[PDB]
């Protein structure tokens, strides 16, 4: 029934690449992680850092989450990420995505495992 911790890894963890390969990276990865199976998830981020380093963020800078909760943490350091955003013309089931490689601080909500 997949834990929320596990769902985070499936959706955002890409530790076997240091950056977005090509233009087709989002295209591939949204499919691969099963994120295009019923609907086209419109926006998603993949972090290219080890799991340990992302897990460590939970012990970094505490900040409010967008929803007003206070269980959000900002990485002290910038991490390698790829933003995936469904294109304007995309439609289920041929999901299309623009891929943007960037270096930025990530902000994640944390909970106990």
């Amino acid at each position: 029934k997949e834990t929320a911790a596990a769902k985070f890894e499936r959706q955002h963890m890409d530790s076997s690449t240091s950056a977005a390969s090509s233009s087709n990276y989002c295209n591939q990865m949204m499919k691969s992680r099963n994120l295009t199976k019923d609907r086209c998830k419109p926006v998603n981020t993949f972090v290219h850092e080890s799991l340990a380093d992302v897990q460590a963020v939970c012990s970094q800078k505490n900040v409010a989450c967008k929803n007003g909760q206070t269980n959000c943490y900002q990485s002290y350091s910038t991490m390698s990420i790829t933003d995936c955003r469904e294109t304007g013309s995309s439609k289920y089931p041929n999901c299309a995505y623009k891929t943007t490689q960037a270096n930025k601080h990530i902000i994640v909500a944390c909970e106990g495992n």
């Binding site: 929320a4 911790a5 985070f8 897990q55 959000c72 990420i81 994640v108 909500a109 909970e111």
Partner: peptide, 11 residues
């Protein structure tokens, strides 16, 4: 002990 469960955003 404490793990990420939602991605809030970048920078």
């Amino acid at each position: 002990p404490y793990v990420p469960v939602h991605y809030d955003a970048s920078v």
